[PDB]
């Protein structure tokens, strides 16, 4: 033969079911060829409709539409419910029978499910994934390794424990010096004519500039240190109020 779909019996079954006798072999080979190609054709079209529904388990609507777009006749009578059997049968084998029939009356009522409503939660605050709310634990070590690959990851003084801000490697080489410039231009406090003019533009810079969600807690600890270290300077507390504005 040539390909799959052995035409010695399949195409033979077809033609001898029609009521012919003379189908040359090579013809049935070529016929197997054609119908297999048509299969791959319809199958790719229904895949195109599959990955717009963004699912994987191809349903029958996919191929039904895939027929409707090929200017090809539809195919009725294939319901998801009442599943399949493929019962056996032998002759002196064919492995075909369908024993799902002999109904007389139906009087069942379908039950409506809930509407489609959404369940928000919180996930991944600032890199760390909580497991307390609706999330997974480390159970993807049990997943199939080709699938789902890769994995890198007490009081009112709390700002975060599962983030590990202790190691000073994360910020940058650049950012430590930037922060030093910032704090040093802030805590200047020499004159009353030019120093405020010298720091106000860094104040109004951190007012509006990007990517600052890396160095926030350092800033928070610094300013809390400022308040607990000193109480007298009207200047420093004024600057910090304006900084929080």
């Amino acid at each position: 033969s040539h390909t799959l779909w052995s035409p010695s019996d399949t195409v033979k079954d077809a033609a001898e079911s029609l009521g012919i006798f003379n189908l040359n072999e090579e013809a049935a080979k070529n016929l197997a060829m054609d119908i297999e190609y048509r299969i791959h054709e319809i199958l790719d079209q229904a895949s195109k409709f599959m990955r717009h529904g963004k699912r994987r388990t191809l349903h029958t609507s996919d191929i039904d539409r895939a027929l409707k777009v090929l200017n090809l006749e539809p195919l009725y009578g294939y319901d998801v419910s009442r599943p399949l059997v493929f019962k056996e049968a032998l002759v002196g084998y064919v492995d075909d029978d369908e024993v799902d029939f002999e109904k007389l009356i139906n009087e069942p009522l379908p039950k409506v499910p809930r509407f489609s409503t959404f369940t928000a939660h919180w996930l991944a605050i600032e890199g760390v994934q909580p497991a307390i709310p609706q999330n997974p634990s480390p159970n993807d070590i049990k997943n199939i390794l080709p699938i789902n690959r890769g994995s890198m990851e007490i009081s009112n003084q709390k700002q975060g424990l599962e983030v590990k801000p202790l190691v000073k490697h994360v910020l940058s080489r650049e950012l430590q010096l930037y922060f030093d410039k910032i704090v040093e231009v802030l805590l200047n406090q020499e004159e009353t004519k030019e120093a405020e003019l010298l720091r106000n533009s860094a104040l109004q810079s951190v007012r509006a500039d990007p990517g600052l969600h890396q160095l926030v807690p350092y800033f928070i600890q610094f300013i809390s240190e400022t308040i607990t270290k000193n109480l007298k300077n009207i200047s420093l507390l004024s600057t910090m109020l304006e900084l929080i504005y």
Partner: peptide, 12 residues
Amino acid sequence: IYSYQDHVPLQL
């Protein structure tokens, strides 16, 4: 595409 619904082979 190993995610069929088992009606497809009958149908095709």
